[model samples]
Target: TTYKLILNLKQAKEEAIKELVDAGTAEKYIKLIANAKTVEGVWTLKDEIKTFTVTE
Candidate 1:
């Protein structure tokens, strides 16, 4: 059997964040929630992850 990871698990969240910032999102709005780990933090950011999606 084999398995695969669609996103770069190590940097997916950060990368998604950077994209938002590049699209004019404010850094201050992007908060790092210690309790809410993983891509959930993306919601914490000001801009929504419009282009992001989970795939298998």
Candidate 2:
């Protein structure tokens, strides 16, 4: 998608990567999240990111 705004959560997309790393997630998730087209898709994308966390 050419919509750069999709990468923006109303802020800098670069910061999003920082927060994701700070949150201790992996590069794979970062790539996955970055590929999302809509808030719902990314939001849903993150929803499952936590699902693997709950496996403990």
Candidate 3:
């Protein structure tokens, strides 16, 4: 099976971070993955780039 991953490297990183923050993820979480050493790691937590999806 082939997965269609339509990502804009130019905007993926920025958009990912924005989505996370909008979802209310913590600043720490945002910083952590936002600065990941590689691109692969970013996709893993694309939903939580800014913070945990946990309720505080």
| Model 1 pairs whose backbones collide | none
In candidate 1, stretches whose alpha carbon ends up further than 4 angstroms from where it belongs are 1-9, 33-36, 43-56
lDDT scores of the candidates, listed in order:
0.45, 0.57, 0.58
**Candidate 2 per-residue lDDT over residues 1-56, each given as its tens digit:** 56533545534334446656666566576677676666656665555555556544
Residue 24 error, candidate 1, Å: 1.9
What TM-score, computed on C-alpha atoms, does each candidate reach? Answer: 0.33, 0.47, 0.46
The all-Cα superposition gives candidate 2 an RMSD in Å to the true structure of 5.8
**Looking at candidate 2, what is the lDDT of residue 21?**
60
Order of all candidates by TM-score, from best down to worst? 2, 3, 1
TM-score of 1: 0.33
* lDDT for each residue of candidate 3 in 4-54, tens digit (9 for 90 to 100): 454455465675577676676555655666665445555556665444457
Query: Stretches of candidate 3 above 4 Å error?
Result: 1-10, 48-56
The candidate, 1 or 2, that scores higher on lDDT is 2
Clashes in model 3: which pairs? Answer: 26-51, 30-50
Candidate 2 has a TM-score of 0.47
Worst 10 residues of 2 by lDDT: 4-13
